[PDB]
Structures are given as structure tokens and as C-alpha cells.
Amino acid sequence: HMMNLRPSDPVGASLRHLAEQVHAVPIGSVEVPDLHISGITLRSQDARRGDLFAALAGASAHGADHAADAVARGAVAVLTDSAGATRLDGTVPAPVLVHPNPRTVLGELAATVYGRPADRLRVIGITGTSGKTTTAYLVEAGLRAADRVPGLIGTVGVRIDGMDEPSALTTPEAPDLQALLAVMADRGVDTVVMEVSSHALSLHRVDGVRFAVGGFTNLSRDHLDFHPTMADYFAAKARLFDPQAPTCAERSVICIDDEAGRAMLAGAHRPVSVSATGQRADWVAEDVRFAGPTAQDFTAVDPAGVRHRLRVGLPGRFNIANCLLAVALLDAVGVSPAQAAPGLRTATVPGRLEPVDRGQDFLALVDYAHKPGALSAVLDSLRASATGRLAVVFGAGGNRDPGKREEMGRVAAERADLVVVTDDNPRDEDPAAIRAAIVAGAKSVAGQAQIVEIADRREAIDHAVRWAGAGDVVLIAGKGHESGQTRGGQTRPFDDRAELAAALVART
């Protein structure tokens, strides 16, 4: 029954001032009161003394049906839409405001209520198809090494001043994010690094955030079950860099190693370009050197002409680009490469090319990639002379884009020496039919990959671990930091890191 995290003593705001700020109007004939509002939420179970409850239309349900409960829990006022109003007329003992489309103003209302936390610290937002999480963790580690106090908001969770924050949401709505930024400022955070997804930029979830710096990794095909076309997907991410958009960051740090990045740079507010593929850019990586199985040395060249010799403590060639972007973002908030370097060398990223070491003589790691494009990239990222043979173990989710299954098999069989097709959250589907589609795609490739099908994921991990010899690479893909195997409405624990470690201890 743990309610969502709020700042302990927010400045708050008068309801009348909030109504004037966003052109909300009273539901009825009574003028908006100067009632003190100390919080805002869209979830009645998170409502508490002093809150404005946002009662909004949603999936086959309207929050107005929960407004009486929110007020009973201590909310002192309600903000709703026209539909909600007709349903709240004279039913709750609290003032009600109506707005044409409240979802579009919740972020700015929460910014006011929580004291404009994005003006108390520097917010870095990072968007792009892949690399948001790794880049964010590298930035957080660089800030800590520089003796700054960082906050991190990402897919895995939230961390504040070096401490996990389990009471915060990983995918906050706009009011939740403002509350979390205020908590961070209260706890001494001077710089927040957060992932900003195309969903968030399309659904008003980062409205009201002043972004000091925006970063762009790359774009490839993804999220087309939400965006109608690639052009809509690009346009959503462009909202972080377009000077005409209210979400535009004050400085844009853009990787130009793909077509989308080059186009983003051309229209971006106050652009800084970054390239780890040899192209001309303000920041470039050069002189990349092998540094053992889980580290890579490189030189970051800054726009002033200074060469910084650095180490990123991650495997995978594309992590040079993520580290270079992290370095440029850190510079944009006043952290030098030398100050950040100890953090870049030691950072760990949960579920993103995350190695597990139990003393074996080969590289064994877990990665989140669960779609063909990301899987192709991570397999390519692990291709290098040091890499003997490469094995990948994965499956595909039930009740998730079935059209990707053959393609995942294809991309794996084009790149890996051993492809182990197993189960990964078959959910309400026939698990054997999912594996069959992946296997068919893998077999359609002309090459020399060995294709093995093992339904049980523990057995599949075990098979790959037993197969590996000195200098080989074993990749367990598709779950990353996410624990669980869901079948027919039941979920059993299954953490790929724990299961990989157990196989390594047993077999190695």
C-alpha cells in the first residue's frame, strides 16, 4: 500500500493561480478558490491530503469514477474534462475544474505545484532507438566520479545520490516526473540524467521539464505499433531538439552516425555533433584499442582540440558511441573527461551487455535486445578479432509482434556460430509455434550457424555455457534486467543474470 513518492514539503500553489495558468474554469457558478494545492496525481490510490486529483478519460474507464475515492483519501480538488464534469456535478465535496484537454497541461501544473524543480538542477534527457540506458548509466557514473550529486531515471529504475529509489516509478506520468525531480533537488541532486522515450514525447509525459541538454543516440525501425510511420517516430523524438517545440532542450548533443542523427542535427537547437564512426563532428572517438574482454580504450577528441584518453568498462563496439555521447553530455553540464573517467571505467549497466564472471575463460553476458534490429546490432557489436565463436540464446514473446520472429532467427543465423532458440514469455500463445517461426527464419539463411531448439530456458542457457571454449562469447538475449517467465497467465521468476551465473558455477 506504498503510495508514490512526493517531495516532503513542496511550495504548492493556489488552485485559482493554477486555473489561470492553464485556462481551466470552474465546473459551475462558484469562482475558483485560493485553495492550497500541495500535489497532483492521476491515480486515486496515490491521492493524499492536499492533492489536486486529475480525473481523466482513459481505456474504457474515466478517472471521474474514482474522484470520490480520491477526495475521501484527502484530495482537496479535482481537475477533469468535459465528459468527467457531467459525471462529477454535485457528487464530490471539493471544487472541480474543467479543461478542454487536461492531459496537455498536467506537466506544467505539476511544475508549479512542486516548485519548478527543473529550475533547481540541470536535466539531461536522452532519446533514440537504442543506447538510452547505457548512455544514461555512463553519465550517472561520470557525475559521481566528478563529485557531483546525480539522479538517474531509466528503464531499469531510479537512483538518487548513489542510492536505489524503489519507491519512484520507472515510467512516470508528467506529474510523477515533476514530483520526482523535486525529490531529487531536495536530496541535493545537481544533475539528473533521464531516458526520454518517443512515447513520452508523444504523450505529454515530459511536459513542464526544462531540459538543459538533450542527447540523441540513433533511430532505427521500432515502435511502429504506436507511431503510424517512421516519419511520425522521428518527429516524436525531434520534439526534444526542435526550437519551436516546448520540450526543446537548451543544448542539443546529437550523434550523427546514422541518417536520422544527421537530420536531427540539421534542425536542432544549439547543436553539438558527436561521431564514433569516423565522420567529422564536434566530438569524435579515435584510436580504439582492445582492453580485455569487458573494456575498451579510446580517445575522445573535444571541439577545443583536446584529446582525452578514456576507458569504457563495457564490451561491444557500439558502446564507444554511447560512451562518447556520455562524455559530450557530461561536458555540456560541466564535467570534464578526466573527472568522469573513473566512473566511465567502472560503470555497470543492468541487462545491457552485462557480463557475468564466475571465473570462466570466455565472455558470458546478458542483453535486453528482443527485436531484430537491436539483436542484429548487438551481435555485430560483439563481432571482433578477439571474439572466437559467438553463441546467442533467445526466444520471442507471446502476444507481441509475431512478424518479427522469422526476422530474429534470420539476423541471429547471419551473425552467430550457435543459435539456441528457447522460450521467452510465450504468454497466451503456443510456445512451440513461436520457436518454430524463429527456427524457420534461422534456417532460411544460407550460412554455417548451428541451430539448436531447447524449450526450457535454463536448459538452453546450460547448453550454450557447455558449448563455450576459451575466447568464445555467450550472449543471453531478450530479457535483460527483467525477471520472469510468463506462461498461460502465471509468471515464474527467471533472471537471466542469476541463471547464467548458476550455469557458469556448475559447468566451468
Ligand X SMILES: N[C@H](CCC[C@H](N)C(=O)O)C(=O)O
Ligand Y SMILES: Nc1ncnc2c1ncn2[C@@H]1O[C@H](COP(=O)(O)OP(=O)(O)O)[C@@H](O)[C@H]1O
363 part of the interface to ligand Y, by CB under 6 A: no
User: Which span sits near ligand X by CB under 6 A: 64-72, 136-144, 265-273, 478-486?
Assistant: 478-486
User: Cell 560503470 appears where?
Assistant: 347
CA distance 53 to 430: 43
What residues line the site for Mg ion (CB under 5 A)?
132-133, 155, 157, 166
First to last CA, the chain: 44
For 275-336, where are the alpha helices, taking DSSP H only?
Answer: 319-332
CA distance 270 to 252: 6
Cell of 152: 538517474
CB of 237 to ligand X, least distance (A): 20
Binding track over 310-339 against ligand Y, x by CB under 6 A: --------x--xx-----------------
CB within 8 A of 371, min separation 6: which ones?
Answer: 222, 401, 404, 408
- The single residue among 38, 155, 252, 486 that binds ligand Y, judged by CB under 6 A, is 155
Compare residues 80 and 252 and give the one whose CB is closer to ligand Y: 252
378 part of the interface to ligand Y, by CB under 6 A: yes
Compare residues 53 and 394 and give the one whose CB is closer to ligand Y: 394
368 part of the interface to ligand Y, by CB under 6 A: yes
CA distance 507 to 304: 51
Compare residues 122 and 352 and give the one whose CB is closer to ligand Y: 352
Compare residues 211 and 394 and give the one whose CB is closer to ligand X: 394
CB within 8 A of 492, min separation 6: which ones?
Answer: 484, 485
CA distance 445 to 224: 26
The amino acid sitting at 47 is A
Chain-centroid distance of CA 491 in Å reads 23
Binding track over 337-356 against ligand Y, x by CB under 6 A: ---------------xx---
**What order do you get walking across the sheet with 77-80 strand by strand?**
25-26, 96-98, 77-80, 51-55, 39-41
Is 134 marked within a binding site?
A: yes
Compare residues 133 and 247 and give the one whose CB is closer to ligand Y: 133
Q: What is the DSSP letter of 437?
A: H
369 part of the interface to ligand Y, by CB under 6 A: yes
User: Which span sits near ligand X by CB under 6 A: 5-13, 324-332, 462-470, 475-483?
Assistant: 475-483
Name the pairing type of β-strands 77-80 and 96-98: parallel
CB of 425 to ligand X, least distance (A): 3
Altogether, the residues listed in the chain come to a count of 508
Binding track over 368-407 against ligand X, x by CB under 6 A: --x--------------------------x--x-------
User: Which span sits near ligand Y by CB under 6 A: 8-16, 80-88, 362-370, 456-464?
Assistant: 362-370
- Count of other CB atoms within 10 angstroms of residue 201: 21
- Count of other CB atoms within 10 angstroms of residue 267: 13
CB of 215 to ligand Y, least distance (A): 11
CA distance 407 to 438: 7
User: Cell 459525471 appears where?
Assistant: 87
CA distance 338 to 308: 7
**Which residue in the shown chain puts its C-beta closest to ligand X?**
397
User: Which span sits near ligand X by CB under 6 A: 150-158, 305-313, 412-420, 474-482?
Assistant: 474-482
Compare residues 94 and 230 and give the one whose CB is closer to ligand Y: 230
Q: Are 367 and 353 in contact (CB under 8 A)?
A: yes
Per-position DSSP letters for 328-341, written without gaps between them: HHHHHTT--HHHHH
- The single residue among 389, 482, 487, 495 that binds ligand X, judged by CB under 6 A, is 482
Compare residues 270 and 400 and give the one whose CB is closer to ligand X: 400
From the list Mg ion, ligand Y, ligand X, none, pick the one residue 148 interacts with, judged by a Cβ distance below 5 to 8 Å according to partner type: none
CB of 158 to ligand X, least distance (A): 17
From the list ligand Y, ligand X, Mg ion, none, pick the one residue 425 interacts with, judged by a Cβ distance below 5 to 8 Å according to partner type: ligand X
List contacts with ligand Y (CB under 6 A): 128, 130-134, 155, 195, 217-218, 318, 321-322, 352-353, 367-369, 374, 377-378
